[PDB]
Amino acid sequence: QQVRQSPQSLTVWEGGTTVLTCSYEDSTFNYFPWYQQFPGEGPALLISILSVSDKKEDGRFTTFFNKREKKLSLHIIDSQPGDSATYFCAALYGNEKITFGAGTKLTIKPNIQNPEPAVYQLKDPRSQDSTLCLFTDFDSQINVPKTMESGTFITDKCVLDMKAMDSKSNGAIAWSNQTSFTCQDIFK
Amino acid sequence: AVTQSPRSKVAVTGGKVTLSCHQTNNHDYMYWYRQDTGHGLRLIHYSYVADSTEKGDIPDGYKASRPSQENFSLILELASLSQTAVYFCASSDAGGRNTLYFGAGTRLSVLEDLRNVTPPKVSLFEPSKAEIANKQKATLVCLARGFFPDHVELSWWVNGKEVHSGVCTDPQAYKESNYSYSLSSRLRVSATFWHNPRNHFRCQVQFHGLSEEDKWPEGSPKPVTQNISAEAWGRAD
Amino acid sequence: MGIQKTPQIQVYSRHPPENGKPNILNCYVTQFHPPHIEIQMLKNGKKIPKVEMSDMSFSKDWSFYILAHTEFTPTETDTYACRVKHDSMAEPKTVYWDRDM
Amino acid sequence: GPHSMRYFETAVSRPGLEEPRYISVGYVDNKEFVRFDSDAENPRYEPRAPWMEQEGPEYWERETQKAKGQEQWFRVSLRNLLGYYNQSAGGSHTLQQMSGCDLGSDWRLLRGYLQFAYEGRDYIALNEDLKTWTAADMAAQITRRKWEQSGAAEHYKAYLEGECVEWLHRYLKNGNATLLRTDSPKAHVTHHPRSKGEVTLRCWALGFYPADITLTWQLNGEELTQDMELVETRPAGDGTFQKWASVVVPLGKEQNYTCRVYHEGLPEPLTLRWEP
Amino acid sequence: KAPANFATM
């Protein structure tokens, strides 16, 4: 395969610079577009460069081309949560058909700087006895535990941002096929 | 514009499936690509003029038809398990370096038995008094459970308008058992927004199942594509 | 568009002609546009079969050119010609071989 | 000295069922070196000079694929122009392209060319800056605007300054010995009476290569202009060329006139006279 | 090598 794109996915902290790279085999390739694909949508041309150039910049996005090492890269400065998407590098020669990389799934996350972790139980009022557990406002370093039991489920870290004020927060949810569980241990 | 139809398809193994694409770019080149678990864009078939088609890189199992300049269809005569994937149509002017303009994609699941297709139970868990008290915030949690296959899209609606601030939805449905998926999301608002009885909160789960093309026998609900919502009003309690 | 150009025709032998020596008759047609053209070589006013046609090419003014050729053995008696039909002209143009040109 | 490379391309639509005829010819220093024709039994780029046999099969494969892409491009472009000019469906129409580069002996790009004609008239051309377009008519303004919006000039600029220059250089290295080959003209003068005591003197040059040549007539050391006729230089069919130039002169004065033949193959120009 | 044209006319 002619266009090699790694990693499968990458996380970069919000405000950091994300660096995405690809390598290619055919040294005659001379046109290198990048496509961005947001979840539930189709890919769309982000930026492109010809092999006669070193770089192309458009706003916060820059592509770099290095012929000698047959490497292409995409830099995103001041990375926003809205840049979370799959990025596809691609290459071709002349009017030959485009070759796409496998794509890198980029997620930009806030690194939370005043964490107050808490665990809460919530109730479904259209139910007899149905409850779940919310683990919220914990720091971006820690690993959310995964279930050590059939019948109980713990979700991955999910980051929200109330753009109403300045309050991003990591959260995760747990529920069980029972009220034998308790929220105050399930999360550590 | 490049528009695909349907948005989602659930088919039986060995069943016939046609994915359609319509473009208004007046472009001569059209393409069908395959994407697997969010990776790759693999060329199946393409066409550079109305009324003919060309084999792409992974043509096997697929036919294409180009009845007009605007329309390019992908045909799976005998759908197999391995054809479960997301399919993207594109157009371009001529080809080579000319930009590809893509449709929004079609998700296909191929199943041994369509009796397994089941819409979600959608449940809305109301915020804990401890959070409201301790943090002056109120996290609502929506849970969709018991659905199959995993063609669901979850959205939140506040006072009749879709919201994106303050939401985090799981990126991937969690498989609870062979034929049963679950998905969660949360919406966080301020305590006083939650405490206002004028505010209406709705979790909507878009389930993609069977369509009109599917026949369904006499006695049970057809598990069709449909919206299922759960709701709650704010309150000063 | 656009601009038609009228074909310019020469008929001449590859080697100096002598009655009774086998030779090649050329019909060189240049400066024409559009590229669609019909070219016959004639002996006594009758189409010669098996006339070969070169590849067509064009010049930096966009006009086309091509070479028709056939084997022939000139005599005192036999007339040779090249006849060309092209949309720049009301009627076909026939150019007789003149051995001094 | 300078050097040039050119690709001359034509697509001609046909009123019947057939797709357009597409032909591409490459030239190095005005010598044909490759050719593609969609009407060949096996349509592919083919070598047209001996020295192109240095290229491997991948060269011919990928050039061929390129031509196949160009053929589609010309087909689409012809159909678009048919709409821009509101022309009837059952006709025949010609689109042509000239592309290439002129290089100095220091391998500097002197000038890049990228231009088109439709129905024998200039349509659009990339300007000398390799950045802006000159469009000849209403339809071409449509094309110009389209190419301005898609950034098309940048792609042609890249080709003209990069590949065109680099491949020309490679072709001149490989083709050097054969590109320098000459065959000298053989010249003679013929004498053809005409009316009222005048004669045509015809100065012939035969069997020469390359085609470039100059023939002049003179009298008493002055080059002539009037009473003069030149035929277009013409192939003999065997890879050499022919030309003649004539003057009309008074009977009795023929031997006063001399013909000069200038050709790069010669150690010096030929001078000759009617020799009865 | 030949040009590979970009946008159609």
What is the Cα B169 distance to its own chain's centre? 14
Domain residue limits, chain A: 1-110, 111-188
**Contact status, residue D79 vs residue B26, Cβ threshold 8 Å:** no
- CB B98 to CB E6 under 8 A? yes
What is the H or E stretch that residue A154 is in?
strand A152-154
User: What sign does the dihedral D102-D108-D110-D112 (CA atoms) show?
Assistant: positive
Chain B contact set for E6 (CB, 8 A): 96-98
Domain total in chain C: 1
The secondary structure of chain B in percent helix, strand, coil, rounded to multiples of 5, reads 10, 55, 40
Scored b (16 or more CB within 10 A) or e, A32-41 reads bbbbbbeeee
Scored b (16 or more CB within 10 A) or e, B169-195 reads bbeebbebeebbbbbbbbbbbbbebbe
First to last CA, chain A: 44
Q: Which of B61, B63, B65 is nearest to B78 (CA)?
A: B61
Task: Give CA–CA dist A144/A151, Å, rounded.
Answer: 18
Q: DSSP state, B116?
A: G
- Whether B98 contacts chain E with CB within 8 A: yes
What is the H or E stretch that residue A121 is in?
strand A118-123
Chain B contact set for D72 (CB, 8 A): 28, 48-49, 94-95
> Who contacts A106 (Cβ-Cβ below 8 Å, separation ≥6)?
A9, A10, A11, A12, A18, A20, A83, A84, A85, A86, A87
Strands B8-12 and B106-111: parallel
- CB D70 to CB A51 under 8 A? no
Q: Which two tokens stand for residue D1?
A: 């000295």
- CB B93 to CB E4 under 8 A? no
Secondary structure in 3-state letters for chain D: CCEEEEEEEEEECCCCCCCCEEEEEEEECCEEEEEEECCCCCCCCEECCHHHHHCCHHHHHHHHHHHHHHHHHHHHHHHHHHHHCCCCCCCCCEEEEEEEEEECCCCCEEEEEEEEEECCEEEEEECCCCCCEEECCHHHHHHHHHHHHHCHHHHHHHHHHCHHHHHHHHHHHHHHHHHCCCECCEEEEEEEEECCCEEEEEEEEEEEECCCCEEEEEECCEECCCCEEECCCEECCCCCEEEEEEEEEECCCHHHEEEEEECCCCCCCEEECCCC
- Angle CA(B111)–CA(B113)–CA(B114) in degrees, nearest 5? 85
Chain D contact set for B97 (CB, 8 A): 155
What is the H or E stretch that residue A183 is in?
helix A183-186
- Determine phi and psi for C46, rounding to 5 degrees: -110, 130
Chain D contact set for C25 (CB, 8 A): none
- CB B95 to CB D155 under 8 A? no
Fold of B1-112: Immunoglobulin-like (2.60.40)
Chain B contact set for A168 (CB, 8 A): none
- CB D118 to CB C69 under 8 A? no
Strand runs labelled E in B100-214? 101-102, 106-111, 121-125, 137-147, 152-158, 161-163, 167-169, 174-177, 180-190, 200-207
Two domains, one topology: B1-112 and B113-237: yes
| Residue position matching structure tokens 């002169």 | D249
**Angstroms from E3 CA to nearest CA on chain B:** 12
Resolution stated for this PDB structure, in Å: 2.0
> Who contacts C101 (Cβ-Cβ below 8 Å, separation ≥6)?
C10, C12, D231, D244
Task: Give CA–CA dist B124/B131, Å, rounded.
Answer: 17
Interface test with B, best of D72, D82, D149 (most B CBs within 10 A): D72
Q: Which residue of A has its CA nearest to E7?
A: A95
Size of interface A-E (CB pairs under 8 A): 3
| Chains C, D in contact, 3 or more Cβ pairs below 8 Å | yes
State which residues form the domain around C81.
1-101
- Whether D131 contacts chain A with CB within 8 A: no
| Residue position matching structure tokens 């034998």 | A180
- Whether D8 contacts chain C with CB within 8 A: yes
> What's the CATH number where C4 sits?
2.60.40.10
What is the H or E stretch that residue B73 is in?
strand B71-76
Q: Which residues pair with D27 in a beta bridge?
A: D6, D32
Method: X-ray
Whether the link from the prior residue into B149 is cis, omega within 30° of 0, is: yes
> Who contacts A58 (Cβ-Cβ below 8 Å, separation ≥6)?
A47
Of 2.60.40.10, 3.40.50.300, 3.30.750.24, 2.60.120.560, which CATH number belongs to B113-237?
2.60.40.10
Q: What domains does chain D contain, in order, with CATH numbers?
A: 1-181 (3.30.500.10), 182-272 (2.60.40.10)
Q: Alpha-carbon Rg of chain A, whole angstroms?
A: 22
Domain residue limits, chain B: 1-112, 113-237
Chain B contact set for A98 (CB, 8 A): 100
Q: Which of D124, D152, D164 sits opposite E6 (nearest CB)?
A: D152
Q: DSSP state, A184?
A: H
Q: Which residue of B has its CA nearest to A157?
A: B170
- Residue type for D53, please? E
**Contact status, residue B24 vs residue B39, Cβ threshold 8 Å:** no
B191 SS3 class: helix
Q: Which two tokens stand for residue B31?
A: 């393409």
B135 SS3 class: helix
Distances (CA, A) of A118 to A161, A168, B82, D254: 17, 15, 43, 118
Task: Give CA–CA dist A51/A19, Å, rounded.
Answer: 20
Q: Which two tokens stand for residue B165?
A: 């601030």
Q: Which two tokens stand for residue B53?
A: 């088609």
Task: Give CA–CA dist D61/A43, Å, rounded.
Answer: 31
CB B136: neighbour CB atoms within 10 A?
11
Chain D contact set for C30 (CB, 8 A): 232
- Whether E8 contacts chain A with CB within 8 A: no
Task: Give CA–CA dist C39/C27, Å, rounded.
Answer: 9
| Residue position matching structure tokens 């007539």 | D217
Q: Does domain A1-110 have CATH number 2.60.40.10?
A: yes
Q: DSSP state, C50?
A: T
- CB B94 to CB D155 under 8 A? no
Q: Which of A92, A116, A134 sits opposite B97 (nearest CB)?
A: A92
Q: Which of C11, C15, C65 is nearest to C43 (CA)?
A: C11
- CB E8 to CB B97 under 8 A? no
**Angstroms from B29 CA to nearest CA on chain D:** 10
Q: Which pairs from A28-32 meet CB under 8 Å and 24+ separation?
A: A28/A93, A29/A2, A29/A91, A29/A92, A29/A93, A30/A92, A30/A93, A30/A94, A30/D158, A30/D162, A30/D163, A31/A91, A31/A92, A31/A93, A31/B97, A31/D155, A32/A63, A32/A65, A32/A72, A32/A89, A32/A90, A32/A91
Chain D contact set for E5 (CB, 8 A): 70, 73, 97
Alpha helices in chain B (DSSP H): 129-135, 191-195
Distances (CA, A) of B5 to B2, B22, B89, B102, B117: 10, 8, 10, 13, 20
Task: Give CA–CA dist B192/B190, Å, rounded.
Answer: 5
Distances (CA, A) of A174 to A22, B138, B170, B204, E9: 38, 17, 12, 20, 59
**Contact status, residue B100 vs residue B31, Cβ threshold 8 Å:** yes
- CB D235 to CB C2 under 8 A? no
Q: Which residue of A has its CA nearest to D162?
A: A52
Strands C38-43 and B121-125: unpaired
- Whether D156 contacts chain E with CB within 8 A: yes
- CB D81 to CB E9 under 8 A? yes
Strands A71-76 and A61-66: antiparallel
